[PDB]
Design a protein around this ligand. Structure first.
Ligand SMILES: COc1cc(Cc2cnc(N)nc2N)cc(/C=C/C(=O)N2N=Cc3ccccc3[C@@H]2CCC(F)(F)F)c1OC
Ligand SMILES: [Ca+2]
Ligand SMILES: [Cl-]
Length: 166
């Protein structure tokens, strides 16, 4: 099971402003949709409520400590262990955010899909710092910038840098 971070962030790692994306880039969201197709989306409750609804074609799994928390068309997990058990047969899952959710899955992450937006927005939640020396870029692509997607941004994908033995 591949554990993958799926994230869009600005030049200071902003991922949200008052439980919202500070930007509107439909093309980016269509990239997310294409990329996570057939695979679970793992998200914290706040991330989920900020998104607004179950994202179709997709196993939506909500991570909250709240044991009474239920929403229709979703699965709820209360810990990382619970998620791994729910996804026992999955090829790959996408940790979909909540800064706190990324931190929870950090010791398990194998793959990073990071959209970097070349701009500084106002924000209050951040993608946590990571040591990128442990990571190796395998794919990059400049996002579509137009009327509907005003900012410049790039899709990046990273895998573990393998150590050469001494
Ligand atoms: C805080 O608010 C949000 C945060 C995130 C998290 C996120 C976004 N982008 C990247 N690259 N990584 C993330 N973790 C998504 C979203 C929304 C994602 C959103 O609306 N979608 N994202 C994937 C998806 C998968 C299946 C069906 C539908 C979707 C839609 C895309 C459909 C479209 F655009 F083609 F019509 C969000 O709400 C605006
Ligand atoms: Ca791993
Ligand atoms: Cl969250």
């Amino acid at each position: 099971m591949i554990v993958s971070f799926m994230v869009a962030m600005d030049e200071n790692r902003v991922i949200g402003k008052d439980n919202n994306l500070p930007w509107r880039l439909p093309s980016e969201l269509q990239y997310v949709k294409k990329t996570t197709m057939g695979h679970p989306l793992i998200m914290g409750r706040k991330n989920y409520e900020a998104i607004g609804r179950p994202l179709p074609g997709r196993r939506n799994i909500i991570v909250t400590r709240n044991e009474g928390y239920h929403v229709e068309g979703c699965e709820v997990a209360h810990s990382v262990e619970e998620v791994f058990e729910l996804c026992k047969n999955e090829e790959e899952i996408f940790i979909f955010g909540g800064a706190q959710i990324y931190d929870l899955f950090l010791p398990y992450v194998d793959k990073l899909y990071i959209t970097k937006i070349h701009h500084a927005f106002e924000g209050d939640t951040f993608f946590p710092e990571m040591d990128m020396t442990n990571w190796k870029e395998v794919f990059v692509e400049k996002g579509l910038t137009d009327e509907k997607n005003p900012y410049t941004y790039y899709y990046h994908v990273y895998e573990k840098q393998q150590l050469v033995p001494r």
